[PDB]
Each structure stands twice: as structure tokens, then as C-alpha cells.
A paper describes a structure:
The superkiller (SKI) complex is the cytoplasmic co-factor and regulator of the RNA-degrading exosome. In human cells, the SKI complex functions mainly in co-translational surveillance-decay pathways, and its malfunction is linked to a severe congenital disorder, the trichohepatoenteric syndrome. SKIV2L activity has now been shown to act primarily in exosome-mediated degradation during co-translational mRNA surveillance pathways (Tuck et al., 2020) by extracting mRNA from stalled 80S ribosomes (Zinoviev et al., 2020). For clarity, we will refer to the human orthologs of the yeast Ski complex subunits as hSKI2 (SKIV2L, ∼137.8 kDa), hSKI3 (TTC37, ∼175.5 kDa) and hSKI8 (WDR61, ∼33.6 kDa).
To recapitulate this scenario in our system, we reconstituted an 80S-CrPV-IRES assembly with wild-type hSKI, incubated with ATP for 15 min and collected cryo-EM data on a Titan Krios microscope. In the corresponding reconstruction, the interaction between 80S and hSKI2 is essentially unchanged with respect to that observed in the presence of a prehydrolytic ATP mimic. Importantly, a fraction of the particles showed no ordered density at the base of hSKI2cat for the entire gatekeeping module. Unlike hSKI in isolation, this alignment was dominated by the ribosome-bound hSKI2 in the open state, leaving the separate hSKI gatekeeping module unresolved. The cryo-EM reconstruction of the open state shows that the RNA in the helicase channel extends with well-defined density for three nucleotides more at the 3′ end (N7, N8, and N9) than detected in the closed state. The base and sugar of ribonucleotide N7 makes polar and stacking interactions with RecA1, resulting in a twist of the ribonucleotide chain of ∼180°. The RNA 3′ end exits the helicase core in a bent conformation, with nucleotides N8 and N9 making only minor interactions with the ratchet helix. Thus, when hSKI is in the open state as observed in the active assembly, the 3′ end of the ribosome-bound RNA traverses the helicase core and occupies the space where the wedge of the gatekeeping module was bound in the closed state. Concomitantly, the density for the IRES structure disappears, suggesting that the PKs unfold as the ribosome-bound RNA is extracted and ejected by the hSKI2 helicase. The RNA-binding mode observed in the open state of hSKI and, in particular, the bent conformation, with which the ribonucleotide chain traverses the RNA exit channel of hSKI2, are similar in conformation to those observed in the structure of the exosome-bound MTR4 (Weick et al., 2018).
Author numbering: 282 to 529, 546 to 1246
Amino acid sequence: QWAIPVDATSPVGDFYRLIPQPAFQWAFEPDVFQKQAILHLERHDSVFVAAHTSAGKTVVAEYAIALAQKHMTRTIYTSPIKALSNQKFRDFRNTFGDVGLLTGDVQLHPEASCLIMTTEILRSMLYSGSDVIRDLEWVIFDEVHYINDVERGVVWEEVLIMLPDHVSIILLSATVPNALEFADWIGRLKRRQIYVISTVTRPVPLEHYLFTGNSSKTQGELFLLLDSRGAFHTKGYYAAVEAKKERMGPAQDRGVYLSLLASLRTRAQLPVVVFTFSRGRCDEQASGLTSLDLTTSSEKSEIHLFLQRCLARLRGSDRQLPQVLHMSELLNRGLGVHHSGILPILKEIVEMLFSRGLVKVLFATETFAMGVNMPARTVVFDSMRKHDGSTFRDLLPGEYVQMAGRAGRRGLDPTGTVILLCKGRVPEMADLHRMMMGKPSQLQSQFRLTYTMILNLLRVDALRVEDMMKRSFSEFPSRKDSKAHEQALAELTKRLGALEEPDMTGQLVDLPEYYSWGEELTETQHMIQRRIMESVNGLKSLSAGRVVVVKNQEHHNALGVILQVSSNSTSRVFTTLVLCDKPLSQDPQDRGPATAEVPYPDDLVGFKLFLPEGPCDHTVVKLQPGDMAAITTKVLRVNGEKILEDFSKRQQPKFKKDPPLAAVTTAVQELLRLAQAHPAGPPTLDPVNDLQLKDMSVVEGGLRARKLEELIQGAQCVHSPRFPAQYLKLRERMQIQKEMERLRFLLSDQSLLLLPEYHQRVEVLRTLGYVDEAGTVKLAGRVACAMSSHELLLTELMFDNALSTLRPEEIAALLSGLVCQSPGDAGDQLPNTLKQGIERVRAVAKRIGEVQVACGLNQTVEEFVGELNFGLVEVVYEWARGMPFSELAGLSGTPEGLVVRCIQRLAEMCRSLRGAARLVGEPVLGAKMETAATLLRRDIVFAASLYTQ
RNA sequence: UUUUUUUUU
């Protein structure tokens, strides 16, 4: 089975009869699904929790560590966000003993038994041994719905395969629908059974209101469009639209926010989290608001004392700059901002002052929605559309669920209200329906090949790269029933030894090739037949007065004339009068499966016109497009309406004995004479030479058919006495051979979709000097292995003598072009040396893109070289001399958070280069970069975290 | 006009 879907609610009745000494004891009672998850964690199973609220999963995520600390063993807790894995660090150090943390720069206590890591580091310490993996029991994958990401979903699937069998896995999730085809994949990729627990109905449910502006001075009206019972209320939506109708940027929005906070302050719904969707819009209304003073005296005193004790670590001028003062003023009134263009010390101050209720309004953004939990009372949105990938799209359902989920608090309020704040135009409830309710999202797999995996797998001998592709989740549906495919192959290989070898010497010489001619020609006509009904020109021909040949299990190439064409052009049902033999029977028991009709030449040229052996009766059948063998050229102007008013009238069981109508008799006699008048079927309405079409495929098909008919009309096998038996036996073996071939291909190695891209990348890799022939890593490959990003470009640049001959205060500016991810530009007040190094680096990028595009890869040289985005070179060059921050702030118009982030991101390459400069043997760039690194990190750019020390 | 991660030796 490999995946056990344990029932969420039914099984557990006795949680304390067994397990009477829980490894951890809370201050309240764990509910049913957490009881079941702990019940399965007791027996050393591997649960897959899928819950809503972040505080329901960490009861398991710390009971597993209480068990880990009880046994002296070790556990690795992995979270994707670098800032989310610090408050967890604080809570695990406060709750019990030693918990080490490892991130891009922090290495706090790398010897504990709760190392907290980002998965991109565990993927880096799986390629080597690292001697920690010998001691694990549990690996708590925290947020496992980042597989659906496009730029990091490959890490979780590179990790989940290489993990050995003895290491148990815990997968916390966010209630995705398709949990049973993923836990089954992990269950049968390893050989352990996996239990799935999924919950709904988070406590303290939430009412989704809608606030539309009116009488912005005091009046606030809230319309209910969703309730505690899931019932959609359209009445509120309608009320909103009329409310917008009677009335029919910053000065109005200020009154909108003062009306919202005026109707909110009258009640106790104070701790309100506004979600804005752009940092300029986020700080604009916070600047323009400018008078609330929502804070009393004692909380003002506590805020002031706390804020100076926390800020007084850093030096003097560094605590007096515009943002710090402005933010302190806002906090003094009780207002905060939490966007991504602010210093991390202020994101941290706002979050640590929001978890104790000393701030009342937060103009947060999605980073607060993901990186922390800290539940608040009332969440208010600000818009419906965001700008993700330059398409300025509408917000999709999965996100909304999370922010709405952090609306209710736990036992400090009855429920939680989520207020949407549509202001510009009507809410357009139609898309609100599928966004605000809807199955959250499936679980995809964004697997792709990078150079790092290829190098770190060629480096090792016992692992092959196609192994990783076969074990990949994007191959799971294909490779699901692999044991059944191989068993079918192995049990039909036995069957192959069975059939006798026939003798074709003489009259049977061309029997196999003839066989081939029979199938393909037939297939061709069907393709041509498809090219007949799919055409718009057939759609003009398809009308009353059309005779067709009908071919299905009931009618065997019986000639019919269509009475009418259905008005519904989707399901083409044709009421058509077709001649058939008068039924000389009423009992289905004499009818049985008969001999498989061998194709004779008389059967393979056109359609053998059936001549009824009995009297010429009629039927009127409701025909499909696929049941008609041919569209005949004849135009019989018969009037369908009277024939319908006669057949449908007569088809009363009581009216089966009506006298025939003249139109029916005339149609039957004319059809019968036409049946006699063509020896094997009249010519069809030619697709090209009669319908005036120009598709090449139909012309090749028609000429191939003509050549095959001429060839088939001379076969010698048709005259042999034992033609049918040997022939049918050959048919059976040929089908078995074809299905075996397809079966082996599906089990073969060419099935992998990305294999040609693997070959092309390997070839381009070997064209540079990184891998010898027959796939053995060379020295440049081993250099490019241990690199963070852009390994190829960095190692090629390092090996060449471009950078070697520059100043240490200039190499930082040269490397600043790889990291900024910001709108870029050139400079004016720059030395000459930087100004020629930029063309050299860009020329190297052009060379790399030209060797990339000259191998088979599809990435144009311009799109590859456009990743090089200089424009922080001057700022980093001035910063890495001793120049203080204020001049940097003045210099140019970019928010000082996206600059400080770039500076640590640069200090992590002038530290990931210590590993390659010490391995190639070039100790003078190492001795310049180990200076250029210690001269760049001195102050609030690299200020230590608050809840770290 | 979003967010975003890549230890040690």
C-alpha cells in the first residue's frame, strides 16, 4: 500500500491508557489530530501533518524533539525562510537546553542536537558526509509546500531522494488536496509506511466582512459576505454595489482610513494588521496619516525604555538617521511599518513589539504574512491584485487563506474578522467566489537540471544522474506501476516461446509485408477520414441531402442518407436513414462473436458495398461522426422533414404497422440502385481536388493509399489454401511484439523527458575544461563544485587573469554586479580600471552564452548576459573604504534595505571564494579578498540580531 | 511595481 490514510477523527479514544508518561506536557489539552500525530510519533512512524494554523503543528514539532533529547539522539529542523528560522531558534532555546543554528552566516553552536538549518545547506552537507548524518533520528521538514516554487522546488526533491532509509521524516504542511499521491511517492520511494493526517476547521473561526467607503468622516458600514458557516452571502455584495452607486488619491484615502479606524477604535478591535502590496504605497499613507496618538502614557514609557535599551548597542550616529527617528515617532503613537525596504533591526523591533500588544496598527506586507506567526485580532486587506512577475496579476487563493488564517487569536477573543477594503471600483464578486473559497492548490514538481547536481553526481561513482531523474516526482505517474510493467514483460517473454514458426516458402512469401500494407493503409484512411469531419468544408457539406456510408459494430458499411443536422454543433448527432437487412430475428442468443475478417483485396479498396441478402428494409439511426465510413459525393434532394414526421410518428410500438410513406420508399429504392451501381464504393468528395484544400498530409496519404492499393491487388497469398490461419497467427504475434516494444520503451531509459537536455548540458560542460571524456571530473569541475551560485562564470573568471590584478576595494565592486537584483545603470565618477573590467566581464559573459547556445541549449546569449546587472558598483566601492551610511543614503535613490541585503550577499561570496582560492593554489587573491571582506562588515549593515544574543 | 536561499572542511 505504501501510504496509509489514517482517519483524522474516528480512531482515537484512548490517549492516556497507553503512553501515560508523555515526553512533554503542555498547559492544556491537545486535540484529536495532534493526539493522533503524537500517537504515531510514539511508535517511530513518519507522519505527514497537513494543518491550517502554525501553532498546531509545532506541538508535534517539539514533542519529536522531546523524544530526541530523551534518547540522546539528534534532529534537524529545516525551514525555508532565513528569518523564520530564528524565532523558532529562540523558542527552542528558551524551552529546553542546547539548540544550534546554521544559516548563511550564523553558525551558533554547531554541536547541539537541534541544529536549525535551511534546506539549501542540508543539500550541501549531503554531498559530503559531514559526519552529523550518522546520528539523526528525525528530520522535521517545516514548510513543505515550497516545492511548488519555480526557483527552489528542486531542492526539496534533491534532498528527499538521497536521505538514507533509517532517518525518519516529519512533513508539516498547509492542507493541500492531493496529499495521497505525494505521501505515496515518499512511502514507496523509501520502504516505510507513511500516515497522512489532514485537518480543517481551525479554532476561533473568522468572519470575512467588506468595508466600502461612505461618509468618510464618521460613518462606517460593514457588509457580511462570508460567515462562520461557509455560506456565501450575495446580499452583502449587492448592498456594496448600490453603496458605490450613490456616491457616483491620498486625500480621500486618509479619510477612508480615518473612518475605518474610527469605527474600529469605538470597539476593542484595535490590533489591526493592514496588508499593503507595494512599499511606496505602504509608507505613503503612514507618512501622510501624521496624527493619531493611539497610545497611553505607561505603554509610551515602556516603548521608549525598551527601544533605547535595544538600540543602544550600536554606536552614536548610527542610531540617528531619518528612518530610525521617523519609525520611533510612529511607534510612539502606536503605528508601525513592516515592508521589505527597511533595516532588519526595525523589522525585528516591530515584530518583537507586536507580539506583546504595544503597537496597534501595522502596515505590514507579505513578508510579515510568511516569516512570522504572532497572531493578531483583525486583518484588513488593501487591494485585490499584486505584481509578482511583471504581469501585475490578481492575488491567487493559496495566499489569501494564510493571511485570513492569522485572524483569530487563541482564547483572547471569541473570533476574528477579516475586512477587505475595496475602494477603487466594485469588488467583482465572481472571481471572489473562487479565490475566497476553493481547493487551495495541487502539489506540483518543478524539477529541472542544474550544473551543481551534475558535477556532484559525476564526482561520485556509485550514483548516476539518470537515477535521480527516474526517482524524481515528475516521473512518479509514469513509474508508479513499474513492478507491474516489468512483471508483464517477464510473463509475456515466457509466452513468446510458444507460437510455432510458420512456413512462407512459396505462395506465402509476401504474407508479412502484405500484412503491413493492410494496417497502415487502413489507418491512413481513418486519418484522412478525420481530416474530413474536422474540416470547416465538411461543416458546409454536412447538411440535408447527403448520403454517407456508416461503419460501426451495428452497421457494416450500410449506405445512409442524412435527414437533419443537429443544432448543437458540439455533439454532432445525425438523424440518418440507413438501409439494413430486415431483422429476421428477435433474440440476442443466436448472435455471437465470429471469425476475425481477414482483409482481402476486395475489402481494402474503398468500402465493399453491402448488398442485403434479404428484403430491403430501413432504419433511422442517431449516428455519430466516427461511425460514418464515408461522405459520398451523391446529392439526393429528399425532404427530411416528412421522413422525420413519418419515422418518429411510426416509431410508436402501436404504430409499427403504418403504411410506408412515399419519400421513404423512394429513398430506399434510390439507395438500393446506387448500391448496385458501384462495384466497391463510389468515389468520395476529394479533399483537395473537390473541396479545394491544400493540406500536404492529405495528398501524401492519398498517393500512398493509391500505391498501396495497386500493390495489394497482386498478392499471391490470397490464393493459398491456408491463408487465414497462418495470417491470424502472424497478427497475434505482431501485436504482441508491438505491445512488448512499447512496454520495454516505457521501462527503458529514453522515457525520461529531460534526457536530451542532460546530454546537451554534459556536452557543453565537457567542451569547457571541467569533465574529461567518459565522464570523469577534472580540476576545474572540482573547483566549480563548491560554489554558491553562477559557479561556471565565477570559476572561469577566477581562472582567467581578469580579476587577479585589481585592488581589494575594487573586487567587491566587480562582484557587486552579480547580486543587486535591482534596476541597473552605469556610472560617471568611476576609475578607469573598473571601466575596463566591466567590458572584460561582459565579454566573458558573451563568450559563455555563445558556448551555451552553440551546443543545443535554448537560452539566448542576450537573456543570459542580461542577468549581469551592474548599478551598485559605486555604492559598494564607496562603502568598502570606511565611508559612513548617511552619504550612502544621500548618494542615490534606493531603499537602504535592498542595499544592506546586497552587502551581506556579497560578503558571502568573498567568503565562498576562500574555499576555491585555497584549493587552486593562488594565495594572493585570497590575501586580498580576506582583507576586502574584513573591511566591509563593521556596523548596522552587519548588526547582530536582537533575539540572538 | 512581489518575494526570494545556497554551512563546514
